[PDB]
Amino acid sequence: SRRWFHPNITGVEAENLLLTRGVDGSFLARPSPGDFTLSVRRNGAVTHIKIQNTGDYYDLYGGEKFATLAALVQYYMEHHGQLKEDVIELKYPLNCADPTSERWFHGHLSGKEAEKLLTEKGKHGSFLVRESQSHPGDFVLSVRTGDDGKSKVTHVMIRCQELKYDVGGGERFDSLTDLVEHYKKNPMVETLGTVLQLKQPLNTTRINAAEIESRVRELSKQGFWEEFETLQQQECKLLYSRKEGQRQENKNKNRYKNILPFDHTRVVLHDGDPNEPVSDYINANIIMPEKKSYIATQGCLQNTVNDFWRMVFQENSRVIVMTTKEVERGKSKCVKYWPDEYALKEYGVMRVRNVKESAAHDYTLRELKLSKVGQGNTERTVWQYHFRTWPDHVPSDPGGVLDFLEEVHHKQESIMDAGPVVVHCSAGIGRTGTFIVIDILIDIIREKGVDCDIDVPKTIQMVRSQRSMVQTEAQYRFIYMAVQHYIETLQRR
């Protein structure tokens, strides 16, 4: 439920809150700038472990790396003994009552503004919660019902008594989230048969592409942080299975043992070595925007290069996007899976020739020839695009990435029957999710024009459902700045 995450809380606030209303084994996560802190109670004391996210993964210091904070909490809740200094136990998640991260919580918002927004954007079952105009401390839940003078908007008061919230009778809830969850499953019914069904909240995020310049400023005075945290709170809905990645036969095929591909979107390799026990696995996912598709994969390991070229050949991909150097900050992020210029290498059953390397300002283009060893009429050209100027920890200007994606999209579109654009970095999420999400957004704007509706968090959530994708708030802000810059250069007429 991720409610163990407390957005607006200080360090000593967490300690007192864990000591007064918690026991040994209780924990909560808190943000405060760019990293996070996991406060855990242990033997009457409270310890603070830090998680650092540089845009590639969540790195719990002294522990493992994870794709989401919920995966970090879930892992250490099932793997007690590996989170040590003395043993530290993640037993009881302490839940937060602050509803700011909820989509249905609009916070400060009047009654007429809620009726207008529920009229313009809401359908049957759309609801919201706001701070009450009439009486301080209390709240109001406004819900729209009808057919799609055939509909109405009903307001329900939610008074706050001794830190508990209720409808005026019946159950009293610890938080507004619990009240919403209950009356969402047990909906209130008016005395005349109509049922106040809470279907889906109001979408305060679908933006028209022409107004991007104003919305970025509305989130700049933090708006970006509040919207990103709302998007982060939905990660518990994307806890799909990853059983094929957790197999002991595939343990040595992942760059990080806890960043695994979803089973329903992973790339399954065929026609493999019968002597190898498992030859169908690769840390990669088919990214389908819900018009090109993508393959988000990890950086190559020395023992996964042959499988990597099997994947490109099998999926008929013709364009690769590398968004990291081989080595960054002294550590290997992706082994060199391509031959030297003018060379010809054999990667298991696949054969790759590096025909030419062209150096641009921010990237290097390599024209590769992928063919099947011992086979004719299998050769095809794979255009590898290696972005080399991404910072170690986002670019201050999106001009290079947009030029990079423009040349990548034009080459992909020029090859008929071309497979998904393979995009990878170190772990395959963060930088990779940023590039793919931006490319989806500018592709909509390039086709439908500057008068089309976009939704950055919804699009991200759609992509995060296919790979466990965007990492930090900085990348989230960079996606907006890239969309804004793309609109700005397209309107030069």
Curated annotation (Swiss-Prot):
GO terms for biological process: atrioventricular canal development; axonogenesis; Bergmann glial cell differentiation; brain development; cellular response to epidermal growth factor stimulus; cellular response to mechanical stimulus; cerebellar cortex formation; cytokine-mediated signaling pathway. Pfam families: SH2, Y_phosphatase. Its main location: cytoplasm. Changing residue 378 to M: In NS1; uncertain significance. One of its GO terms (cellular component) is mitochondrion. The modification Phosphotyrosine is found at residues 57, 61. GO terms for molecular function: cadherin binding; cell adhesion molecule binding; insulin receptor binding; molecular adaptor activity; non-membrane spanning protein tyrosine phosphatase activity; peptide hormone receptor binding; phosphoprotein phosphatase activity; phosphotyrosine residue binding. Changing residue 256 to C: In NS1 and LPRD1; does not affect subcellular location; decreases protein tyrosine phosphatase activity against CDC73. Phosphorylated upon activation of the receptor-type kinase FLT3. Phosphorylated upon activation of the receptor-type kinase PDGFRA. Phosphorylated by activated PDGFRB. Changing residue 286 to V: In NS1; benign. Residues 4-94, 104-202 form the SH2 domain. Widely expressed, with highest levels in heart, brain, and skeletal muscle. It catalyses: O-phospho-L-tyrosyl-[protein] + H2O = L-tyrosyl-[protein] + phosphate. InterPro entries: Prot-tyrosine_phosphatase-like, PTP_cat, SH2, SH2_dom_sf, Tyr_Pase_AS, Tyr_Pase_cat, Tyr_Pase_dom, Tyr_Pase_non-rcpt_typ-6/11. Changing residue 242 to Q: In NS1; increases MAPK signaling; increased protein tyrosine phosphatase activity. The keyword Cell wall biogenesis/degradation does not apply. Substrate binds at residues 392, 425-431, 471. Changing residue 57 to D: In NS1; also in Noonan patients manifesting juvenile myelomonocytic leukemia. The active site is at 425 (phosphocysteine intermediate). Keywords: Acetylation, Cytoplasm, Deafness, Disease variant, Hydrolase, Nucleus, Phosphoprotein, Protein phosphatase, Repeat, SH2 domain. The SH2 domains repress phosphatase activity. Binding of these domains to phosphotyrosine-containing proteins relieves this auto-inhibition, possibly by inducing a conformational change in the enzyme. It is linked to LEOPARD syndrome 1: A disorder characterized by lentigines, electrocardiographic conduction abnormalities, ocular hypertelorism, pulmonic stenosis, abnormalities of genitalia, retardation of growth, and sensorineural deafness. Acts downstream of various receptor and cytoplasmic protein tyrosine kinases to participate in the signal transduction from the cell surface to the nucleus. Positively regulates MAPK signal transduction pathway. Dephosphorylates GAB1, ARHGAP35 and EGFR. Dephosphorylates ROCK2 at 'Tyr-722' resulting in stimulation of its RhoA binding activity. Dephosphorylates CDC73. Dephosphorylates SOX9 on tyrosine residues, leading to inactivate SOX9 and promote ossification. Dephosphorylates tyrosine-phosphorylated NEDD9/CAS-L. Belongs to the protein-tyrosine phosphatase family. Non-receptor class 2 subfamily. This is Tyrosine-protein phosphatase non-receptor type 11. It comes from Homo sapiens. The lineage of its organism: Eukaryota, Metazoa, Chordata, Craniata, Vertebrata.
